[PDB]
Each structure stands twice: as C-alpha cells, then as structure tokens.
RNA sequence: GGACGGUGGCCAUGGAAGUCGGAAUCCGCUAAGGAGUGUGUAACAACUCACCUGCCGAAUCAACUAGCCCUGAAAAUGGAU
C-alpha cells in the first residue's frame, strides 16, 4: 500500500514534469483544504498543481533527470513547504489568477494576526445576545432599539501578535474581515531558466 | 471572577494533573507511571477530576 | 475610587437601559456623586458621608454658601486632581514639573478617613488624640476610656453620623 | 553494557570565558561570575579552542545511569553561561478571587511580605536566596519580577513564594488563589 | 444592504411541524418573516422534496420565496416512491456541479456511492455514461 | 501547517449535524481527511485526534520474556545472615 502509493507518486510527478516543460515552485502557506480545492478547480483546465513530500520529489527528479536536463536547477530551491505548478500557458495568466483567488481566513484561538482590525462605533445589527462577550472583551456598550450599538472605538488587536480566544469569537460575530493569506509562488522555472 | 488567563495559569498548577490510582500521588499531566516507590511505579493513572 | 466609579456606572447603565423614561416622563434619572444622589459609608459601624458634607466642611474650613458648596462638590469628584505641594486643583493628570497628582476625591476624602483608620488599627494614641482636635468633633463621655475597634466605631459615628 | 566513550561539547560565546579548576567550573561574563563544582560526577572536563572556546565533557566506561550525567553537566554549564550573559528573570503573577494579595518588597529585594493571602491575618515573610532580587513590576498590576544569575537560586526563590501562598483545607480546584510563576525568561532579551 | 440579509439556508421539512421544527428558532434571524413567513415557507416547501427540504429563503420584506437545491439524498428519496442509473445520470445536470471534481463521472460515482443508504459493485466496473452528461 | 462536498449520510426525535444511540463502513479532490479518536454544545460552533506535509538529519518503535532489585509485605519485652 505505502510503497505502491510512493511509486505511483513518482510516476505521477515524472509524467507531469515530462508533459509540461515549464513549471513554478510554489509556497504552500497556511491554505486550507478548501482553498487547495478551489485553486485546483480554478486551474482544473488551465495547468496542474502537484504537492507532496519534498524528500520524495528531490529523489525522483534526481533519479530521472536523465531524460531531460536542467531539472537539477530546481533542487536548491525546493525547500520548506513547496510544491510544483506544471503549466502550458504563459506566466502572467497563472500568476495573477492564483493571486486573484484569495480567501479571507478568520482569526481563531491561538492565532497570529499580521493585519490590524479596529472595531467601529457602529450598530452591531443583531439582538442583545452578545453583551456577555462584549463585557468580557471590555467593550462597554449601550442598549437601544432591541439591538446593540458600539459607543466608542477600541484598538481590538495589533499586528503580528497573539489573538485571544474570547476575542476571535467577537471578531467572528462582528463579521470583520481579518488578515488574509493565499498561495504564493516561490519562483518560476522555464526549461532551464529561473526567475521570480 | 478571575480573568481566564490567570485562571488557567492557576489551573496549570492546581488542576491539570494525573492522579495515581493506588497512592493518590499528584503527577504531571504527561505522566505514564507514578514516581513513588510505595505503589511500585504503577501505570494505573487517571486524570485529576474537574469541577465540571 | 475605581470600584466606586464602576458601581455607579453599572447602576447608571442598568437604569438607563431599563428606564426608557429619560428626560421627559421623569426628567433625568441618572445618579452622579456630584449631584449628591449617592452616599458613602458603612451601616455596621454607623457612619456615612456625602460629597455634600465633605464640600461643606471644606468650605467651612476655607445662599452664597450653597453655591460655594455646589462648586466645591463639582470639583471634588471625577478627573480633577489636587497638588498637595501647592494646595491647588488641576485638570492635568500630572503636575507641570512631571509629578503625578492624586485625584481630588481620593486625596481630599479618602486620605483623612484612611489616616484615621490606620491610626486606630495601629494604636497611635497621640495621633488619635490630636486628630480629634483636628476634626473639631464633639466627644461625649464613655468613649474616652476605651480604645480599639469599638473606638473606631465610636469615632466614626460621632464624626460622620 | 559499558559504553567506551560518551562525550558532549558546549560552545562558549566571546563575551564570556570559562575557567576549570578540576571539576569546578567558573563562568565569568559581563553580568558577574558564577561558580559550580561537579565533584559528584566522575567526568573529564576539557577546554579546546583559543578562538571559539569549546568545553567538552567526556565520560569513559559509563553505564546507563552515568551516561545521563553528561547532558546534565552540559545543560548546567549552558545555564551558567546564559545567567552570566543574559540573566534569569521569572515573572510571577498573583491571582485571587476576592482578597487582593499585598506584596511588600523589603531590603534590596531580599524579603517578600505577603499580607492578605485569602484574607488571613498571618503575614508571610519569604527570604530570597542570595544573589536573587525581587521587585514589583511597574507594567502589570499584580506581578513580581525575580532577577538573578543562577537559575537554581532564582527558580528556588520563585518556588518558595509559590509554596508560601498555598490554600489549605479547601478544594484547591475552586480556591485558585496564590502566586504562580507566569513566565521564565532572560534580561536584555539578546 | 438590499433591505434584508436572509441568505441563510434552511433544513426543515417533512410534516409542517411548526413548534417541533426549528422555524421559530430561525425566525429571529430575519425578524421580518416570523410565524407567517416560516409558515408560508412550509406552504411552499411541503413537497419538492417531501423530506428535510434543504432550501434557501429570500425575503420580499414581507413574503418569502424558497429556492431548493437538489441534494443527492433528497432527490433519490423523492424519486423513490435496483439499478435506476438512468435517472441519477440526469439528476445532476442542474446541481451546483462543483463537488471538487475533475470530470462528470465523479458526480455519478458520488451518487452511486451515497445511494448505499448493493449499489457498490457498479462503483468499480462502470464504463457506461462516462461522458454522457457533458 | 492542512485535517475538505454530497452529508445537518438511513432510522430512531422533543435536539441529537462525525462524536446518547440500531444498523450500515462510499466515492470525488487528493499529500491527506475516519461519512469519525476523544473533549465539548440543547443542537451547532470551537478544540483535538488518524492521515498527510514542513523543520530537524540517524536509527527508532511495540509486544512479550527472565535475571537481580523494588511494591505487594500488619503484632504484641529489645534483638538477631
Ligand atoms: Mg534543554
Ligand atoms: Mg470542607
Ligand atoms: Mg522482598
Ligand atoms: Zn502511585
């Protein structure tokens, strides 16, 4: 089972690199399974994105560089959480398409927020059923019209720090778009040339 | 009425622990065997009961 | 002071959110210590005071008297600070030199009460005797002969009924 | 089984130098001097470089129990280096439900007076180990800072405070009051 | 904001239910429909399907219209009053058809797989209608 | 770091959405994702596992077994290799 899967992965990567002479090395950041599925369905007819074990990728391409040279140039660059994007079209189309299909990731418990989000002094819009959470986070409010209205601005969280568990749910209930991050291309490999 | 951060800091020392079933010794949460001779370093451990 | 402010703020917010009878049916219904609609004290020890009483005794130390008492009362609570070195109020949280000044409420109300409490519980007979003439309080019989926690009760009773 | 040789090397920065007197290690850095003797462990201590200052710990013909001491000695020496370069700072938050815990720092941060732990009239006087200074942080509300050079002494002083503030005859799952070591770090954060 | 945000979906059905159904629980989400809104919702969603009726409601600021996506279990239980492959072949020409798929045979694979609730032998050796849908 | 769609999979219902339960036990995307290991919720949600991936670069893990030692192992006058 395991050895069969590894051999099948070797076969898949070698046939894909043979089919597409030009490919990108792409950084798989903290993108969810749904985000990988949506980029897969976005390039369902454009190109192919292939991930897996870097230790396997290095070994297979080093063992089967013989049928096509200039494959060794990708070796010192496939490090960390990286994968391949074998393509037939140009660079710009795939580049700006995978930069275009961004997905906003909501902050959760034990999360890092590179972006700053600030609560406004605007009506929440729902019933007064989050007063306990508002008082826990410290935002003292007023009650009117069967809803909740924020009476002041509060610096909710800073940039690149730790977000609290009783603060992530407050951001979720207020429905503010937090820091977002998608899929970024490490570099581009065109038949023997490497570019940004 | 303690804020949750300080509450969990106190609970790290007071509640998040293992108890030996033979000698009731208070062991660290990742314990597998009791550290005391009088039970024979038994691995009969349970979590410390919560107030829930 | 922070605990007192939290209590009065909580009472004000609950009376606002359930008392939709704002200005109108009953007029203003909020409570402010400046307005004199909150009191401070302890019932077990039989003593209580108001910003009105403290303002009045400071004015006495210092129809028109009512206005003066109201002015001192307004300046005696809130984010007003007092410089003990200069004996003057200030809106600034710190002195112009850079020394932080205690606020008027604490400095001019709690500090004497805290001083007498500390003196009585630490058994400073000479200071407890001289604060009597400092406060100019009348002192009847049966209390000069005993000291301690009942002495604290008696002196607070006869100072702030 | 007797392993022929078990060795481990630690690296010494430039700003700190280490002298050996048999098995007594003297670690001299910017923040002072530390000194600790390992005569209870039969090891060979060597200094190697005149450029990078490697200290190597060797154990010959050891068994399972005394191969465990090589890494222990290396960790102690690394902690000494860390103490004389960056120092050890333990931050202790004091938690309470009802009664605030009043902590008064006596002479030069050597005595700690806990006054109102759970509202009892007894006063706790904790004596810090020599070379350890205690203070009340100016940043947070209820926080003690214990600064020193020896991790042994600093952590032992923190444990003295923590065990001094101990609830008795009560459900300690409910009564969480006390002073607890919040975090352990360095000074100057280099 | 188009005067209403009622795009949240709904998964009650079968009998009217009313109190037993989560309609009074979801009523405050809009606060416009209330009992009349979530009763006309059941009026429009009694059938198609006769099941839990996974739908999406749209508010005309007094009235409510329910668009019912074709859930696979819903449509198979509704089409039931055996192979029956010819009906499930066309049962997904109107679905979302995203399914994190690559070709059309994935959908019929998923249908034959989910209809086990045996229709599993036909899962492996299937060659008819591979590209029939597109 | 990820841990996805049908699917809040069928029937139990007053809610049991992967986790009170009676049965079944799939596929697509896949590097990986159990129509579910536990925590948890009224149910959700949120944690967490089992599965993969990155850093790390060399051996490691499990179940048994039998030697010595320890626990099991409590008595009365002070005491017996
Ligand atoms: Mg270590
Ligand atoms: Mg008791
Ligand atoms: Mg024995
Ligand atoms: Zn034990």
Give DSSP secondary structure letters for C74-93.
Answer: HHTSSS-EEETTTTEEESSS
Token digits of residue D146: 């214990």
Alpha-helix runs per DSSP H in B1-52: 4-14
Q: Which of D43, D46, D56, D52 is nearest to D17 (CA)?
A: D52
Distance CA D181, CA D91 (A): 6
- Strand partners for C81: C90, C103
Centroid of ligand 1 to alpha carbon of D72 (angstroms)? 9
State how far the alpha carbon of D40 is from the alpha carbons of D1, D2, D3, D55, D71, in Å. 22, 20, 20, 19, 15
Residue A160 φ/ψ, nearest 5 degrees: 65, 45
State how far the alpha carbon of B22 is from the alpha carbons of A71, A166, B49, B50, in Å. 63, 39, 16, 19
Residues on D contacting B at a C-beta cutoff of 8 Å: 93, 95-97, 162, 171-174, 176-178, 180, 182
Q: Which residues contact D60 (CB under 8 A, 6 or more apart)?
A: D4, D5, D44
Cβ of residue B15 lies below 7 Å from strand F:
no
**Subunit partners of chain A (3 or more CB pairs within 8 A):** C, E
Q: Is B26 helix (H, G, I), strand (E, B) or coil?
A: strand
What is the length of chain A?
A: 196
- Strand partners for E65: E58
Q: Peptide bond preceding D88: is omega within 30 degrees of 0, i.e. cis?
A: no
State how far the alpha carbon of D52 is from the alpha carbons of C135, D119, E16, E28, E34, in Å. 74, 56, 82, 72, 78
How wide is the angle at C-alpha D83 spanned by C-alphas D81 and D84, nearest 5°? 70
Token digits of residue E102: 């690559």
Distance from CA of C19 to the nearest CA of A (A): 11
CA–C1' gap, E68 and F34, in angstroms: 30
- Beta strands per DSSP E along chain E: 9-10, 55-59, 64-67
Residue C44 marked as a ligand binder: yes
Residue C43 marked as a ligand binder: yes
**How would you class B39 by CB atoms within 10 Å of its CB: exposed for 0-12, middle for 13-18, buried for 19 or more?**
middle
Distance CA E31, CA E35 (A): 10
- Beta strands per DSSP E along chain B: 18-20, 26-27, 45-47
**Subunit partners of chain B (3 or more CB pairs within 8 A):** D
Handedness of CA C102, C104, C106, C108 (dihedral sign): positive
Residue C94 φ/ψ, nearest 5 degrees: -130, 155
Please state, as a whole number, how many other Cβ atoms lie within 10 Å of the Cβ of residue D164: 15
Q: Which residues contact E61 (CB under 8 A, 6 or more apart)?
A: E3, E4, E32
Cβ of residue E76 lies below 7 Å from strand F:
no
Contact predicate D30/D85, CB 8 Å: yes
Residue A101 φ/ψ, nearest 5 degrees: -80, 70
Cβ of residue A106 lies below 7 Å from strand F:
no
Cβ of residue E11 lies below 7 Å from strand F:
yes
Distance CA C92, CA C74 (A): 16
| Nucleotide showing the shortest C1' distance to residue E12 CA | F8
Cβ pair E100:A127 closer than 8 A: no
For chain A, what is the HEC assignment?
CHHHHHHHHHHHHHHHHHHCCEEEEEECCCCCHHHHHHHHHHCCCCCEEECCCHHHHHHHHHHCCCCCCCCHHHHHHCCCCEEEEEECCCCHHHHHHHHHCCCECCCCCCEEECCCEEECCCECCCCCCCHHHHHHHCCCCEEECCEEECCCCEEEECCCEEECHHHHHHHHHHCCCCCECCCEEEEEEEECEEEC
Cβ pair A44:E100 closer than 8 A: no
Distance CA E134, CA E132 (A): 6
Distance CA C52, CA A71 (A): 88
The torsion angle over the Cα atoms of residues E78, E83, E85 and E86, rounded to 10 degrees, is: -90
Distance from CA of D175 to the nearest CA of B (A): 9
What is the length of chain B?
A: 52
The torsion angle over the Cα atoms of residues E62, E65, E66 and E69, rounded to 10 degrees, is: -140
Contact predicate E111/E95, CB 8 Å: no
C34-38 contact pairs (CB < 8 A, 24+): C34/C73, C34/C74, C34/C76, C34/C77, C34/C78, C36/C73, C38/C8
- Beta strands per DSSP E along chain D: 3-11, 17-21, 24-29, 32-37, 44-47, 54-62, 88-95, 103-105, 111-114, 124-127, 132-136, 143-148, 178-186
Cβ of residue A75 lies below 7 Å from strand F:
no
What is the length of chain E?
A: 134
Q: Which residues contact B10 (CB under 8 A, 6 or more apart)?
A: B2, D95, D176, D177, D178, D180
CA–C1' gap, A138 and F37, in angstroms: 37
Contact predicate E76/E110, CB 8 Å: no
Distance CA D123, CA D140 (A): 23
CA–C1' gap, B18 and F72, in angstroms: 23
Query: Scanning every residue of chain A, which has its alpha carbon at the shortest distance from the alpha carbon of E97?
Result: A41
D163 alpha-carbon distance from chain centroid: 16
Distance CA D117, CA A185 (A): 58
Token look-up 């839990």 returns E52
Q: Which of A40, A103, A98, A52 is nearest to A78 (CA)?
A: A52
How wide is the angle at C-alpha D178 spanned by C-alphas D147 and D139, nearest 5°? 45
Q: Is D146 helix (H, G, I), strand (E, B) or coil?
A: strand
Q: Is D22 helix (H, G, I), strand (E, B) or coil?
A: coil
Distance CA E39, CA D27 (A): 82
User: Nearest bound ligand to CA B22?
Assistant: 4
- Beta strands per DSSP E along C3-151: 40-42, 47-49, 81-83, 88-90
Cβ pair D162:B51 closer than 8 A: no
Token digits of residue A107: 């902050």
User: Nearest bound ligand to CA D74?
Assistant: 1
- Strand partners for A37: none
Centroid of ligand 1 to alpha carbon of D14 (angstroms)? 22
Q: Chain E residues with CB inside 8 Å of A41's CB?
A: 98, 100-101
Q: Is C17 helix (H, G, I), strand (E, B) or coil?
A: helix
**How would you class A64 by CB atoms within 10 Å of its CB: exposed for 0-12, middle for 13-18, buried for 19 or more?**
middle
Cβ of residue A32 lies below 7 Å from strand F:
yes
Half-sphere exposure of B45 (CA within 13 A, CB side): 21
Cβ pair B11:D176 closer than 8 A: yes
Query: Scanning every residue of chain B, which has its alpha carbon at the shortest distance from the alpha carbon of D163?
Result: B13
42-61 on A, CB < 7 Å from strand F: 50-56
The torsion angle over the Cα atoms of residues C123, C126, C127 and C133, rounded to 10 degrees, is: 130
């Amino acid at each position: 089972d395991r050895a069969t899967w590894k051999s099948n992965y070797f076969l898949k990567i070698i046939q894909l690199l043979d089919d597409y002479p030009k490919c990108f090395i792409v950084g798989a950041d903290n993108v969810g399974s749904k985000q990988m599925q949506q980029i897969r369905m976005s390039l369902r007819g454009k190109a192919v994105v292939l991930m897996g074990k870097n230790t396997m990728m290095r070994k297979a391409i080093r063992g089967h560089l013989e049928n096509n040279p200039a494959l060794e140039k990708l070796l010192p660059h496939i490090r960390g959480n990286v994968g391949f994007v074998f393509t037939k079209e140009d660079l710009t189309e795939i580049r700006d398409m995978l930069l275009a299909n961004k997905v906003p990731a909501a902050a959760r418990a034990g999360a890092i927020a590179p972006c700053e989000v600030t609560v406004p002094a605007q009506n929440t819009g729902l019933g007064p059923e989050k007063t306990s959470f508002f008082q826990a986070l410290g935002i003292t409010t007023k009650i009117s019209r069967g809803t909740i209205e924020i009476l002041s601005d509060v610096q909710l969280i800073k940039t690149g720090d730790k977000v609290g568990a009783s603060e992530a749910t407050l951001l979720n209930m207020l429905n503010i778009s937090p820091f977002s991050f998608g899929l970024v291309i490490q570099q581009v490999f065109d038949n023997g040339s490497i570019y940004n | 009425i303690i804020e949750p951060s300080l509450r969990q800091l106190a609970q790290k020392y007071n509640c998040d622990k293992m108890i030996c079933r033979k000698c009731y010794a208070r062991l660290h949460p990742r314990a597998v065997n009791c550290r005391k001779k009088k039970c024979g370093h038994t691995n009969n451990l349970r979590p410390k009961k919560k107030v829930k | 002071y922070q605990t007192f402010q939290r209590i009065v703020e909580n009472v004000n917010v609950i009376i606002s959110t359930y008392g939709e009878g704002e200005s109108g049916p009953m007029g203003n219904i909020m409570i402010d210590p400046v307005l004199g609609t909150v009191g401070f004290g302890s019932g077990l020890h039989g003593w209580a005071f108001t910003l009105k009483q403290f303002a009045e005794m400071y004015v006495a130390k210092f129809a028109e008297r009512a206005k003066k008492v109201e002015d001192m009362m307004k300046k005696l609570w809130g984010d007003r600070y007092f410089d003990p070195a200069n004996g003057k109020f200030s809106k600034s949280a710190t002195s112009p030199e850079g020394k932080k000044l205690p606020r008027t409420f604490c400095q001019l109300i709690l500090d004497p009460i805290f001083k007498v409490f500390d003196a009585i519980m630490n058994f400073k007979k000479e200071e407890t005797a001289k604060l009597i003439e400092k406060l100019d309080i009348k002192l009847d019989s049966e209390d000069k002969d005993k000291e301690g926690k009942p002495l604290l009760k008696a002196v607070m009773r006869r100072w702030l009924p | 089984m007797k392993t022929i040789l078990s060795n481990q090397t630690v690296d010494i920065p430039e700003n700190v130098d280490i002298t050996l007197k048999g098995r007594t290690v003297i670690v001299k850095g910017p923040r002072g001097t530390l000194r600790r003797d390992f005569n209870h462990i039969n090891v060979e201590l060597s200094l190697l470089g005149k450029k990078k200052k490697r200290l190597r710990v060797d154990k010959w013909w050891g068994n399972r129990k005394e191969l465990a001491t090589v890494r222990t000695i290396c960790s102690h020496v690394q902690n000494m280096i860390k103490g004389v370069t960056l120092g050890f700072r333990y931050k202790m938050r004091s938690v309470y439900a009802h009664f605030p815990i009043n902590v008064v720092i006596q002479e030069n941060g050597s005595l700690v007076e806990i006054r109102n732990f759970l509202g009892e009239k007894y006063i706790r006087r904790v004596r810090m180990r020599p070379g350890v200074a205690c203070s009340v942080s100016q940043a947070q509300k209820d926080e003690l800072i214990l600064e020193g050079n020896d991790i042994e002494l600093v952590s032992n002083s923190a444990a003295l405070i923590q065990q001094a503030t101990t609830v008795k005859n009560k459900d300690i799952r409910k009564f969480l009051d006390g002073i607890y070591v919040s975090e352990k770090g360095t000074v100057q954060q280099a | 904001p188009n005067e209403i945000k009622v795009v949240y979906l709904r998964c009650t059905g079968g009998e009217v239910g009313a109190t037993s159904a989560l309609a009074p629980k979801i009523g405050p989400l809009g606060l416009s429909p209330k009992k009349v809104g979530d009763d006309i919702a059941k009026a429009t969603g009694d059938w198609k399907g006769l099941r839990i009726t996974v739908k999406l409601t749209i508010q005309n600021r007094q009235a409510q219209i329910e668009v019912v996506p074709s859930a696979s279990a819903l449509i198979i239980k509704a089409l039931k009053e055996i192979t029956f492959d010819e009906i499930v072949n066309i049962a997904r020409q109107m679905r979302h058809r995203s399914l994190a798929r690559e070709l059309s045979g994935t959908i019929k694979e998923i249908l034959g797989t989910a209809q086990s609730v045996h229709p599993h032998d036909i899962i492996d050796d299937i060659n008819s209608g591979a590209v029939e849908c597109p």
